[PDB]
Design a protein around this ligand. Sequence first.
Ligand SMILES: CC(=O)N[C@@H]1[C@@H](O)[C@H](O[C@@H]2O[C@H](CO)[C@@H](O[C@@H]3O[C@H](CO)[C@@H](O)[C@H](O)[C@H]3NC(C)=O)[C@H](O)[C@H]2NC(C)=O)[C@@H](CO)O[C@H]1O
Ligand code: CL
Ligand code: CL
Ligand code: NA
Length: 129
Amino acid sequence: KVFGRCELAAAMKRHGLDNYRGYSLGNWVCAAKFESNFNTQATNRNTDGSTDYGILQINSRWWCNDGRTPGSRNLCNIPCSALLSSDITASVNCAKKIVSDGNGMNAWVAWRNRCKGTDVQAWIRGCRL
Ligand SMILES: CC(=O)N[C@@H]1[C@@H](O)[C@H](O[C@@H]2O[C@H](CO)[C@@H](O[C@@H]3O[C@H](CO)[C@@H](O)[C@H](O)[C@H]3NC(C)=O)[C@H](O)[C@H]2NC(C)=O)[C@@H](CO)O[C@H]1O
Ligand SMILES: [Cl-]
Ligand SMILES: [Cl-]
Ligand code: NA
């Protein structure tokens, strides 16, 4: 599923991401935009053999099991394919654990390089929230 911008904003708010660990909703929408282009089915292989999955590009070295990332963990206790669903529940629940793990939203490379320190509120302009 390719979400609309305000559609995804509404979904993340309902699932409790707006100001989760202090990160306003626009941060999460900006992260999703540049990680996946709002596409729940996005996948991308990394040089270390791991793969990033879903709307928030959650990585199989740490967070989910995809059966092909040796020596990895599965800290969200979830198959990585669950992160590709049109229902973003699994991705949001896992994202809450990632952002709580010490480095905040710096765990998302695209967030650090393209959202951090910008006017992220613009990502929820015009949305009925
Ligand atoms: C969205 C996503 O999947 N991002 C991936 C990053 O999570 C991952 O970075 C590494 O993440 C782990 C887990 O959070 C980091 O380990 C944690 O480090 C903190 C700070 O030192 C420490 O307090 C925690 O105890 C420790 N947790 C565990 C379970 O060990 C690790 O430092 C990150 N590595 C970095 C930032 O280089 C990166 C790299 O695999 O991939 C992203 O896609
Ligand atoms: Cl915001
Ligand atoms: Cl933080
Ligand atoms: Na894994």
